[PDB]
Amino acid sequence: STPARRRLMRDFKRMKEDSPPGVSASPLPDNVMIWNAMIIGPADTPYEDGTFRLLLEFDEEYPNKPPHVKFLSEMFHPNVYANGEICLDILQNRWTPTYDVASILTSIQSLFNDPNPASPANVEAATLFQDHKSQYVKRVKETVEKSWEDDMEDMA
């Protein structure tokens, strides 16, 4: 009933009524401060048809504080660190309270479309995106097939 927990429940109604294309998310049946989220890779990106699962961590300062958001799937992306945490400007310093679950995920989903250089989380990924696009795509195509094996039990 606290201001954070009430605002989050609205985001769940948002995801339930009009879920953005290629995205789903839901809180834990026993804890609304943790959400299981999953982003499907958009078309014409090397992350195409990839089913990548995420984990969202909130505190009582939401929506005034950006949630701590990190990936659970193996990811090869210049912006995604090795621990799952993401170098997304919206999350770090561009936080605007008008962002809900739906927008946070499509923003990350859109990092697959056109990534952001000079934010080197995976130097391997950042450099290979500039020097050997084939080897970059080969490594991403691997993270896409490995994403498909989960069976998405976090969605029921």
Binding site: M15, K16, D18, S19, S24, M38, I40, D49, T51, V144, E145, W148, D151, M152, E153, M155, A156
Partner: protein, 159 residues
């Protein structure tokens, strides 16, 4: 077959999308691989026809050698021509002839009483390249036809 387009995706929908996504990735390699099988048939066939086709060129050169060793002046050249006649292996023979075709032609022209044209070593070099680039051109054109025909029947199946 499960949807509900307005309702958020379900575990049953993502598995049904992961399965279909597997097929799309699968069919990409299946198609890419089956065309590479098609190319290997194209390559293997050309390998056998090319090897088979040289038997006319090789045997006719052995004929010219035999008629010339008897009237050769140099003993180094008589030995080399006897090596040609006594090799009895077309793959080895063909390499002996192609590597020494300049020398071989000169020996036949000198002994049989013809004027060895000057600039004749470059004449053979440019003749073998012209013939090779012609065969390589035609092969890549058949590779295009056979690949086009391969993919076209696949697209035909979809419609």
């Amino acid at each position: 077959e499960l949807s509900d387009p307005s309702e958020p995706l379900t575990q049953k929908d993502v598995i049904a999308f992961q399965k279909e996504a597997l097929f799309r990735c699968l069919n990409k390699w299946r198609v890419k691989a089956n065309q590479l099988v098609e190319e290997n048939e194209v390559l293997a066939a050309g390998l056998s026809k090319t090897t088979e086709s040289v038997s006319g060129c090789c045997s006719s050169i052995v004929v010219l050698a035999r008629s010339v060793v008897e009237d050769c002046s140099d003993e180094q050249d008589k030995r080399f021509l006897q090596q040609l006649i006594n090799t009895e292996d077309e793959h080895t023979l063909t390499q002996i002839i192609s590597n020494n075709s300049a020398r071989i032609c000169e020996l036949i022209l000198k002994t049989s009483g013809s004027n060895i044209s000057d600039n004749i070593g470059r004449l053979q070099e440019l003749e073998s390249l012209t013939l090779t680039l012609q065969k390589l051109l035609k092969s890549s054109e058949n590779k295009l036809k056979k690949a086009t025909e391969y993919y076209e029947n696949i697209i035909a199946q979809y419609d």
